[PDB]
Amino acid sequence: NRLILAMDLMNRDDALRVTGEVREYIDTVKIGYPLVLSEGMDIIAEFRKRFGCRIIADFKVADIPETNEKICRATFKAGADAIIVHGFPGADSVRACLNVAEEMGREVFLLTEMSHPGAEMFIQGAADEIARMGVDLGVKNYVGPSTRPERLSRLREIIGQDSFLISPGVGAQGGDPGETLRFADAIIVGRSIYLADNPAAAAAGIIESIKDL
Amino acid sequence: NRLILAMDLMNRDDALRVTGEVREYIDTVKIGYPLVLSEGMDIIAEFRKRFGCRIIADFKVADIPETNEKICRATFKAGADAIIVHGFPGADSVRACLNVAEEMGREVFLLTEMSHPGAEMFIQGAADEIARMGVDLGVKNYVGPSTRPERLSRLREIIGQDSFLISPGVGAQGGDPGETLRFADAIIVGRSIYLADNPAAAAAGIIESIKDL
Ligand SMILES: *c1c(F)c(=O)[nH]c(=O)n1[C@@H]1O[C@H](COP(=O)(O)O)[C@@H](O)[C@H]1O
Ligand SMILES: *c1c(F)c(=O)[nH]c(=O)n1[C@@H]1O[C@H](COP(=O)(O)O)[C@@H](O)[C@H]1O
């Protein structure tokens, strides 16, 4: 695959239909707050049972250590395989997530630099240090921006070749599968697939581009 | 009051009992992901209907603009009066939240500097600029740390006297109601109340200290 579906539809019926339509082209579904806050955490269990795919909970966890632990424990209890957590709040907040993931046999992904224009204001300047903090904490899974492949390159340099790196911002945000997969292990794609007239054809089209690399 | 309850219990029965016990000492309940991810967004509507108090959704929103809008729209649809959003992701992410709050007749609180030790690593260095970004965006409600009253002072200086400023980190995290209320309009208190043998007595004790100021 190398393709992770960002399932940000907000209606259970549509989320299930689109995921079902594209599942032959992905092995991982990324579920975030647009779907969870609309349909409840039980949606994570349903997706697991219906589809079998890995579930990453994209909750961009960004609270104090005590609250981060509670968020992680609720999320894994609901059946998520991994959770995405922000590095910007610092090492104690990240460690809290890693401690729960250890307890529960799950994975943490560290979000380093974000893909949107606003990320340039504060996040970008800290992002190398956030990545290096990850390495120092023993984080093995990272998120970095498809929209800035030169920053992906730098992040890959920091985390090394033996870390797993996934990357949002492909399609709608302007990122390209090829420029991104030079550095990331897998791309995250939401709207380019789930808003397409034929999501299966969109996913298939992306997979064809990936195979050509 | 000047007291906001951080309701981070993870069981509907306990959350309702403790809130009911202390409601005569607060007019605002802050509900976050520990309770919502455990009991569902319907908990917000229940609290509103049972208690009448203002509800602030402490979701520390930290995504891209398009996703931030979806998160805000789901949260207000569930009945929250206000949402807490991170400033660190930048102005476009914040504006997205403000646009939804405008559409829906609700409020955004901008989180500037966080209260925990890790906030020193990256957030603190950006926090003055995040506050000034808030002012430039017309944000009128802010969150800053009880644990660092000198930073609260600086944040108050930036936002001015006509902005509303609320402050977590009182009690469990080491913050003091008095040192904090020199600068903040209201303090947020969670564990010092909700883990107390008698939460009503804990809240009452805090209110007594506040009245003495
Ligand atoms: C999260 C994040 F931290 C980013 O830096 N960028 C980003 O886009 N996200 C989330 O990833 C998905 C992108 O979907 P698409 O732009 O393909 O529709 C979304 O879930 C977004 O929240
Ligand atoms: C959020 C935040 F952004 C902070 O800087 N600090 C902080 O503590 N929070 C949240 O506020 C409440 C504090 O509760 P207490 O320490 O009194 O138990 C919690 O909801 C925490 O997530």
Swiss-Prot record, chains A, B:
Organism: Methanothermobacter thermautotrophicus (strain ATCC 29096 / DSM 1053 / JCM 10044 / NBRC 100330 / Delta H) (Methanobacterium thermoautotrophicum)
Entry's Gene Ontology cellular component terms: cytosol
PROSITE patterns assigned to the protein according to its UniProt record, in alphabetical order: OMPDECASE
SUPFAM superfamilies found in the cross-reference section: Ribulose-phoshate binding barrel
Enzyme class: lyase
Assembly information from the UniProt record: Homodimer.
Recorded name of the encoding gene: pyrF
NCBIfam families according to UniProt: PRK13813.1, pyrF
GO terms under biological process: 'de novo' pyrimidine nucleobase biosynthetic process; 'de novo' UMP biosynthetic process
Gene3D superfamilies in alphabetical order: Aldolase class I
Active site: 60 (proton donor)
Protein task: Catalyzes the decarboxylation of orotidine 5'-monophosphate (OMP) to uridine 5'-monophosphate (UMP).
Lineage top rank: taxon: Archaea
Protein name: Orotidine 5'-phosphate decarboxylase
Catalysed reaction, written as an equation: orotidine 5'-phosphate + H(+) = UMP + CO2
Pathway as given in its UniProt record: Pyrimidine metabolism; UMP biosynthesis via de novo pathway; UMP from orotate: step 2/2
Residues involved in substrate binding: 8, 30, 58-67, 115, 168-178, 190-191
E.C. number: 4.1.1.23
Gene Ontology MF terms: orotidine-5'-phosphate decarboxylase activity
Keywords per UniProt: Decarboxylase, Lyase, Pyrimidine biosynthesis
Family: Belongs to the OMP decarboxylase family. Type 1 subfamily.
Alphabetical list of InterPro entries matching this protein: Aldolase_TIM, OMPdecase, OMPdecase_arc, OMPdecase_AS, OMPdeCOase_dom, RibuloseP-bd_barrel
Lineage summary: Archaea, Methanobacteriati, Methanobacteriota, Methanomada group, Methanobacteria
